[PDB]
């Protein structure tokens, strides 16, 4: 799914307390392997684990939902 934020952090866990691993530019498109609850970002507290293995706040990914579109991370 595509990134909608203008430079979005990808963190080592589902929340803003976790270290930043890398970033994506707006219009990057990422594969989401699973989703996990975490810090609320503007009403969406889901975090999306990408194929890079780090988590992007779902607020900044265009999935057409503020809830789950994939399996919950185990
Ligand atoms: Zn995609």
Numbering used by the authors: 1 to 74
Give sentences copied directly from the paper behind this entry.
Muramidases are N-acetylmuramide glycanhydrolases which cleave the β-1,4-glycosidic bond between N-acetylmuramic acid (NAM) and N-acetylglucosamine (NAG) in the carbohydrate backbone of the bacterial cell-wall peptidoglycan. Here, the identification, characterization and X-ray structure of a novel fungal GH24 muramidase from Trichophaea saccata is first described, in which an SH3-like cell-wall-binding domain (CWBD) was identified by structure comparison in addition to its catalytic domain. A ‘domain-walking’ approach, searching for other sequences with a domain of unknown function appended to the CWBD, was then used to identify a group of fungal muramidases that also contain homologous SH3-like cell-wall-binding modules, the catalytic domains of which define a new GH family. The properties of some representative members of this family are described as well as X-ray structures of the independent catalytic and SH3-like domains of the Kionochaeta sp., Thermothielavioides terrestris and Penicillium virgatum enzymes.
